Amino acid sequence: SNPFAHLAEPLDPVQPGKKFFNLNKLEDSRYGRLPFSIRVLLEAAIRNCDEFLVKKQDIENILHWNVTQHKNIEVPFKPARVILQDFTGVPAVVDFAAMRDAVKKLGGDPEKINPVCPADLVIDHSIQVDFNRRADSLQKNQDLEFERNRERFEFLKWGSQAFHNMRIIPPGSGIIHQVNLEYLARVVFDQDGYYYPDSLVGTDSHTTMIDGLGILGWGVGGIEAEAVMLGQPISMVLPQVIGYRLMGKPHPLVTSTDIVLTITKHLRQVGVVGKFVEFFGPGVAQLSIADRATIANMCPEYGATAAFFPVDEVSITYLVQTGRDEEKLKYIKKYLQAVGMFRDFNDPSQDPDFTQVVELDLKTVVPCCSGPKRPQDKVAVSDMKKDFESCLGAKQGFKGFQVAPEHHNDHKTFIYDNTEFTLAHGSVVIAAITSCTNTSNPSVMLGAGLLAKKAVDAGLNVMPYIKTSLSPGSGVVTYYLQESGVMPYLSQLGFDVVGYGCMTCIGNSGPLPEPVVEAITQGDLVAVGVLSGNRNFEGRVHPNTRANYLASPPLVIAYAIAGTIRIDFEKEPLGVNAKGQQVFLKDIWPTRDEIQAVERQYVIPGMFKEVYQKIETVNESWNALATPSDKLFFWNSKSTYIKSPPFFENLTLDLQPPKSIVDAYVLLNLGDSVTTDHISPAGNIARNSPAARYLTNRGLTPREFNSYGSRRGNDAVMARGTFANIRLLNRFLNKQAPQTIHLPSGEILDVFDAAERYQQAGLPLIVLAGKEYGAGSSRDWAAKGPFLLGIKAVLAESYERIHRSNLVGMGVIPLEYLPGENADALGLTGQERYTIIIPENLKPQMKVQVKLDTGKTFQAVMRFDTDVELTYFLNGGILNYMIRKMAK
Ligand code: SF4
């Protein structure tokens, strides 16, 4: 039974059948000092205590957090639900279908492969900015989306019928996280007579955006989410919690976006990988839910697992504003208050006992952007011109473009729409109001509109060759931009709505005008994209922009109007007004107070009701998609999108022990901050690549390639796409190239081709890497890929959280250098042959010996961090383990 059953009591004696586990009846003073993020873990353990998956000791360990956070203690966590998008959602449903095949093969019941919690999937990663700056651009983009992705859509739609508990939010509805915040989020569950906190994992690294609403959620690989949907607890080392104390007031010109870029930079410096961050202090109460969500969104960019803002009265106000049901609201606040999970940030006596506290005085926040090449590279708006011009001549890097000083004032004329324009270094060519990060925030969306109106009335324009776009994460945005009268002015500046999906945020940015591309390449220009996103890594916004700056939506507009980031907005006007002459940014910038009025006036629950009323059913094209009635997927050999994966080939019920990796070759020698984009690119498929050759062989032209993310249900493409990022910096080649050296022959080959040779010869492979290996996107293809290339281990200085978990899930060993040790320090070339000794008895975090064919030996930490992770390793993977459990 549940040992804590006595804690269950009615919330309200008027409705005696609706109960909750009352953590206050624990009568334990440790509870009242817990970070509110830890209280969520505690509750989930108590309600789920069976003495099997979740044990009474587990509850004590979580309660004893203040002590046990230092004792490397694993705990279970069963979240309330799972959220997915289509890029990671396709391979997830392929995994499920493949697991059903495997379970049937072994004589099990394939209906056991079925989500036992709610799964919501939002289709947002497929639409691209094929067209912009026109009224019909949205329809034209929506049409191409469906035309390009029909098979994937029919497949997801079948998935939503063939597996229990799956709701799909169709194309043209907005973006996962914004839809989560405005519609999908429960805050408090009311299931089978028990209230409990909403919590989740999502197959997207920015799932942490939900934490702004006091919902404990974070990103995970699909394989981890798959296990969770099947009832497997998350296994984690009980985390330390950094208290981020906010104080002061932001200046009225400062935006949510300025604040998050400031905090991102701040927390990467601090180092919070493997930890929760939990916000508190007098400064939190002034932040709206949208503001808190902006900050929480960027959790993976600063490294943490969670960035938590507990539920307070501001959260409740957001729920009433977004039109949540009256009945539900009643028990959300009432439940949180009764259980001790309801916050008042204005009461220091209620502040938890965090591991340590770090501080931000919001008055120190200045208007800012981040770039040109990393989310943590904060640049004051006041210093944008200076910093870029410094970048022009600096050695090629995150803060260098390496342009000879003589050319810093280069410019190229070009003709666009029979008018001559001049492009130069720092010219803005992409200006996209994009990303759930910011479009969920009416302060910056209306800010952007009010700036647009001011500018238009002031007689300002955006040059017509500039690829401006507006890509909202829900239709509520457009609705209030129209009601408020600001949308026509956005339209005139070139910010018509182009789609309701990720779009430019994810690199789905579409073509630049031919004459603009010409000038850029012919002139050797550093052309600039400015976007309200959370990621700006070289090449991931557009192939032709060497500089990308994250900035608030109104700044996106400001740089569009100015047409360059090499501008001192204080010193230089934007243009000349036909009457009062000089028009400066200051004159057109809306104040916090002018924004708050329009927001208070135009963002009412009725709009949310209206937008979301028909969300699941309105898409006639979706509704039209025919699906088979099958429960077991009819794999089609003709498909280039959907393919039965080899993962479970010849799977046996019984386990055989792990053997050492013997005389492994190093497939790639990598450096620092290798992103999952480098490991498993998701955008354009290059004409000179293994994946292009495969698709060509199958009779497709480049225009039919689609993106890598779109091909994730086809392991044949995805293996070929592994380490195929054209900006991979393999230290074997000392240059950017998606290649490596096949050492036996000395030949330089595309990475997949080189791996084939090694695999044909029966040779094991490893990867050497530096710090922060696997940063960024949650994509488990950055683990499945290497697994299919024959990679048995990685040896790195440090790992990012989601990536490490995906490696473990695929049975690949994540090895870590000992402190003060790395490739240079050990004198490794990567051209040696590597023996990793696996002992008969394994322990989490154990050190193993690595032996080289040269005689050199050293030690590495084996980063299986919990007993459960070790069982995954012994099983050859997390889904292997789950098939075995379900087959018997
Ligand atoms: S790619 Fe951008 S818009 Fe899409 S879910 Fe991620 S953060 Fe949001």
XYZ file of N, CA and C in Angstrom, residues 9-143:
405
model
N -6.636 13.788 2.917
C -7.845 14.353 3.493
C -8.498 15.300 2.485
N -9.816 15.544 2.620
C -10.482 16.474 1.717
C -9.936 17.887 1.838
N -9.809 18.545 0.693
C -9.465 19.942 0.663
C -10.604 20.741 1.261
N -11.828 20.349 0.923
C -13.005 21.122 1.252
C -14.113 20.158 1.671
N -14.573 20.242 2.936
C -15.635 19.369 3.465
C -16.962 19.438 2.705
N -17.110 20.445 1.844
C -18.300 20.593 1.004
C -18.219 19.607 -0.163
N -16.993 19.202 -0.484
C -16.718 18.305 -1.590
C -15.757 17.231 -1.064
N -16.261 16.327 -0.202
C -15.381 15.472 0.615
C -14.566 14.459 -0.202
N -15.020 14.154 -1.414
C -14.347 13.171 -2.276
C -13.102 13.678 -2.982
N -12.869 14.982 -2.917
C -11.688 15.561 -3.552
C -10.652 15.811 -2.479
N -9.604 14.991 -2.491
C -8.604 14.966 -1.436
C -7.184 15.370 -1.916
N -6.257 15.492 -0.975
C -4.870 15.753 -1.312
C -4.025 15.171 -0.207
N -2.777 14.835 -0.524
C -1.812 14.452 0.507
C -1.302 15.669 1.254
N -1.685 15.785 2.526
C -1.335 16.977 3.285
C 0.061 16.909 3.901
N 1.035 17.484 3.201
C 2.428 17.448 3.642
C 2.661 18.150 4.964
N 1.716 19.000 5.359
C 1.765 19.670 6.664
C 1.475 18.730 7.822
N 0.763 17.652 7.535
C 0.476 16.646 8.533
C 1.651 15.683 8.723
N 2.743 15.935 8.008
C 4.002 15.247 8.280
C 4.513 15.707 9.633
N 4.052 16.887 10.046
C 4.476 17.506 11.303
C 5.994 17.458 11.427
N 6.662 17.903 10.367
C 8.103 17.874 10.273
C 8.590 19.256 9.847
N 9.396 19.854 10.708
C 9.863 21.225 10.518
C 10.856 21.378 9.358
N 11.336 20.257 8.825
C 12.244 20.329 7.685
C 11.493 20.846 6.454
N 10.229 20.442 6.318
C 9.384 20.795 5.146
C 9.288 22.305 4.883
N 9.118 23.098 5.942
C 8.926 24.551 5.819
C 10.164 25.316 5.399
N 11.308 24.634 5.346
C 12.542 25.300 4.905
C 12.997 24.845 3.519
N 12.326 23.833 2.994
C 12.633 23.299 1.668
C 12.433 24.296 0.530
N 13.367 24.317 -0.448
C 13.054 25.050 -1.683
C 11.703 24.551 -2.207
N 10.906 25.435 -2.794
C 9.568 25.039 -3.230
C 9.668 24.017 -4.378
N 10.746 24.097 -5.145
C 11.027 23.075 -6.173
C 11.224 21.673 -5.560
N 11.814 21.615 -4.368
C 12.016 20.315 -3.699
C 10.708 19.768 -3.115
N 9.823 20.663 -2.664
C 8.450 20.281 -2.200
C 7.640 19.550 -3.268
N 7.863 19.904 -4.532
C 7.200 19.196 -5.640
C 7.689 17.758 -5.741
N 9.010 17.579 -5.634
C 9.604 16.243 -5.660
C 9.090 15.449 -4.466
N 9.056 16.095 -3.304
C 8.561 15.431 -2.103
C 7.135 14.925 -2.287
N 6.245 15.790 -2.760
C 4.827 15.413 -2.928
C 4.696 14.223 -3.865
N 5.396 14.277 -4.995
C 5.318 13.208 -6.022
C 5.772 11.853 -5.458
N 6.719 11.902 -4.519
C 7.236 10.689 -3.897
C 6.206 10.112 -2.953
N 5.623 10.974 -2.119
C 4.637 10.564 -1.103
C 3.401 9.940 -1.749
N 2.840 10.624 -2.746
C 1.607 10.141 -3.392
C 1.866 8.834 -4.143
N 3.104 8.661 -4.597
C 3.488 7.504 -5.404
C 4.208 6.399 -4.654
N 4.338 6.544 -3.332
C 4.991 5.526 -2.505
C 4.244 4.184 -2.582
N 4.908 3.168 -3.117
C 4.343 1.823 -3.171
C 5.237 0.816 -2.444
N 6.420 1.281 -2.033
C 7.501 0.446 -1.500
C 8.205 -0.393 -2.574
N 7.944 -0.061 -3.835
C 8.540 -0.755 -4.973
C 9.362 0.247 -5.800
N 8.715 0.959 -6.721
C 9.392 2.012 -7.487
C 9.788 3.184 -6.588
N 8.954 3.456 -5.591
C 9.146 4.583 -4.690
C 9.003 4.076 -3.266
N 10.078 4.210 -2.495
C 10.177 3.633 -1.147
C 10.082 4.703 -0.052
N 9.677 4.277 1.149
C 9.519 5.185 2.281
C 10.814 5.954 2.553
N 11.942 5.263 2.437
C 13.239 5.914 2.577
C 13.408 7.060 1.589
N 12.904 6.883 0.368
C 12.980 7.936 -0.661
C 12.346 9.215 -0.157
N 11.216 9.087 0.540
C 10.494 10.234 1.082
C 11.331 10.933 2.161
N 11.963 10.139 3.035
C 12.868 10.678 4.054
C 14.079 11.385 3.431
N 14.726 10.740 2.463
C 15.836 11.393 1.739
C 15.515 12.756 1.124
N 14.326 12.883 0.528
C 13.881 14.147 -0.078
C 13.612 15.212 1.001
N 12.805 14.855 1.998
C 12.624 15.681 3.210
C 13.920 16.159 3.865
N 14.908 15.269 3.888
C 16.213 15.542 4.506
C 17.161 16.273 3.537
N 16.564 16.905 2.514
C 17.297 17.629 1.483
C 18.468 18.471 1.982
N 18.251 19.291 3.007
C 19.298 20.216 3.405
C 20.630 19.488 3.665
N 20.528 18.250 4.138
C 21.690 17.378 4.381
C 22.018 16.494 3.165
N 21.009 15.797 2.648
C 21.239 14.781 1.622
C 21.643 15.355 0.246
N 21.395 16.647 0.023
C 21.850 17.305 -1.220
C 23.372 17.208 -1.369
N 24.060 16.887 -0.275
C 25.506 16.838 -0.276
C 26.023 15.423 -0.264
N 25.105 14.457 -0.257
C 25.488 13.065 -0.060
C 25.295 12.189 -1.310
N 25.119 12.820 -2.477
C 25.111 12.113 -3.761
C 24.076 10.972 -3.725
N 22.847 11.325 -3.351
C 21.775 10.360 -3.095
C 20.756 10.391 -4.230
N 20.476 9.239 -4.835
C 19.488 9.223 -5.927
C 18.072 9.146 -5.387
N 17.152 9.766 -6.109
C 15.750 9.722 -5.757
C 14.897 9.512 -7.000
N 13.701 8.929 -6.822
C 12.772 8.834 -7.918
C 11.971 10.120 -8.112
N 11.551 10.371 -9.346
C 10.564 11.420 -9.598
C 9.589 10.973 -10.690
N 8.299 10.970 -10.357
C 7.268 10.705 -11.351
C 6.475 11.978 -11.619
N 6.748 12.651 -12.761
C 6.046 13.893 -13.104
C 4.572 13.656 -13.445
N 3.775 14.710 -13.430
C 2.347 14.538 -13.718
C 2.036 14.254 -15.199
N 2.900 14.688 -16.113
C 2.601 14.640 -17.565
C 3.840 14.864 -18.436
N 3.668 14.735 -19.753
C 4.768 14.865 -20.708
C 4.323 15.781 -21.839
N 5.235 16.617 -22.328
C 4.904 17.445 -23.494
C 5.911 17.218 -24.629
N 5.439 17.254 -25.871
C 6.335 17.015 -26.998
C 6.059 18.023 -28.097
N 7.032 18.180 -28.992
C 6.826 18.918 -30.245
C 7.050 17.915 -31.389
N 6.901 18.328 -32.653
C 6.965 17.358 -33.764
C 8.390 16.913 -34.127
N 9.385 17.776 -33.930
C 10.748 17.394 -34.319
C 11.188 16.191 -33.504
N 10.940 16.228 -32.204
C 11.317 15.084 -31.331
C 10.152 14.104 -31.173
N 8.984 14.531 -31.632
C 7.733 13.749 -31.484
C 7.667 12.630 -32.509
N 8.120 12.910 -33.738
C 8.169 11.840 -34.752
C 9.049 10.656 -34.264
N 10.356 10.882 -33.983
C 11.176 9.750 -33.513
C 10.630 9.083 -32.240
N 9.991 9.843 -31.347
C 9.331 9.256 -30.182
C 8.273 8.229 -30.575
N 7.392 8.567 -31.530
C 6.330 7.642 -31.942
C 6.941 6.492 -32.742
N 7.999 6.767 -33.512
C 8.761 5.657 -34.116
C 9.308 4.704 -33.029
N 9.921 5.246 -31.957
C 10.413 4.413 -30.829
C 9.275 3.576 -30.241
N 8.165 4.222 -29.950
C 7.000 3.488 -29.442
C 6.573 2.352 -30.375
N 6.450 2.634 -31.671
C 6.053 1.611 -32.664
C 7.054 0.466 -32.685
N 8.349 0.813 -32.706
C 9.436 -0.171 -32.645
C 9.425 -0.994 -31.343
N 9.157 -0.342 -30.219
C 9.033 -1.075 -28.967
C 7.872 -2.052 -29.009
N 6.776 -1.674 -29.668
C 5.624 -2.608 -29.784
C 5.999 -3.876 -30.551
N 6.755 -3.694 -31.634
C 7.259 -4.796 -32.464
C 8.115 -5.702 -31.590
N 9.044 -5.081 -30.861
C 9.971 -5.815 -30.004
C 9.231 -6.602 -28.916
N 8.308 -5.951 -28.209
C 7.518 -6.631 -27.162
C 6.725 -7.816 -27.736
N 6.137 -7.641 -28.918
C 5.397 -8.736 -29.569
C 6.315 -9.910 -29.915
N 7.460 -9.598 -30.525
C 8.506 -10.586 -30.853
C 8.869 -11.474 -29.682
N 8.999 -10.858 -28.508
C 9.423 -11.542 -27.284
C 8.269 -12.282 -26.614
N 7.075 -12.165 -27.189
C 5.894 -12.862 -26.671
C 5.100 -12.066 -25.653
N 5.379 -10.769 -25.575
C 4.683 -9.891 -24.664
C 3.465 -9.263 -25.304
N 2.773 -8.439 -24.522
C 1.588 -7.715 -24.984
C 1.958 -6.309 -25.443
N 1.958 -6.063 -26.758
C 2.416 -4.750 -27.239
C 1.514 -3.570 -26.819
N 0.296 -3.858 -26.352
C -0.542 -2.813 -25.736
C 0.046 -2.304 -24.414
N 1.059 -2.984 -23.883
C 1.741 -2.467 -22.702
C 2.560 -1.240 -23.056
N 2.908 -1.106 -24.342
C 3.559 0.115 -24.847
C 2.471 1.148 -25.083
N 2.227 1.948 -24.050
C 1.172 2.954 -24.060
C 1.399 3.945 -22.928
N 1.377 5.252 -23.238
C 1.477 6.267 -22.176
C 0.428 6.067 -21.063
N 0.885 6.155 -19.821
C 0.026 6.050 -18.635
C -0.116 7.434 -17.954
N 0.427 8.463 -18.594
C 0.182 9.836 -18.196
C -0.205 10.663 -19.420
N -0.774 11.859 -19.196
C -1.072 12.712 -20.353
C 0.167 13.084 -21.182
N 0.043 12.997 -22.508
C 1.058 13.485 -23.427
C 0.400 14.465 -24.381
N 0.943 15.676 -24.438
C 0.493 16.694 -25.363
C 1.619 16.951 -26.340
N 1.282 16.926 -27.626
C 2.267 17.198 -28.667
C 1.792 18.346 -29.539
N 2.668 19.344 -29.722
C 2.358 20.565 -30.486
C 3.212 20.565 -31.743
N 2.577 20.754 -32.895
C 3.323 20.756 -34.156
C 3.748 22.181 -34.492
N 5.018 22.471 -34.233
C 5.509 23.843 -34.318
C 6.820 23.955 -35.080
N 7.506 22.825 -35.329
C 8.885 22.886 -35.846
C 8.963 22.712 -37.357
N 7.808 22.686 -38.024
C 7.760 22.357 -39.429
C 7.599 23.543 -40.393
N 6.987 24.618 -39.923
C 6.728 25.766 -40.796
C 8.028 26.594 -40.922
N 8.243 27.180 -42.105
C 9.485 27.919 -42.430
C 9.102 29.275 -43.004
N 9.973 30.288 -42.891
C 9.653 31.618 -43.464
C 9.989 31.622 -44.952
N 9.263 30.805 -45.709
C 9.415 30.807 -47.161
C 9.050 32.175 -47.702
N 7.992 32.742 -47.138
C 7.541 34.058 -47.584
C 7.394 34.970 -46.380
N 7.643 36.264 -46.590
C 7.431 37.274 -45.558
C 6.974 38.636 -46.124
N 6.579 39.533 -45.223
C 6.254 40.933 -45.517
C 4.979 41.155 -46.333
N 4.128 40.140 -46.406
C 2.857 40.315 -47.074
C 1.728 39.713 -46.272
N 0.532 40.169 -46.598
C -0.676 39.706 -45.935
C -0.860 38.201 -46.123
N -0.492 37.690 -47.289
C -0.777 36.295 -47.614
C 0.400 35.385 -47.289
N 1.426 35.951 -46.666
C 2.646 35.200 -46.396
C 2.357 34.020 -45.450
N 1.511 34.259 -44.449
C 1.121 33.215 -43.506
C 0.480 32.016 -44.208
N -0.481 32.273 -45.105
C -1.152 31.159 -45.792
C -0.168 30.420 -46.670
N 0.693 31.163 -47.353
C 1.643 30.553 -48.265
C 2.654 29.689 -47.506
N 3.055 30.131 -46.316
C 3.953 29.314 -45.476
C 3.237 28.085 -44.920
N 1.968 28.253 -44.569
C 1.190 27.150 -44.006
C 0.976 26.047 -45.035
N 0.712 26.468 -46.267
C 0.551 25.559 -47.392
C 1.826 24.753 -47.654
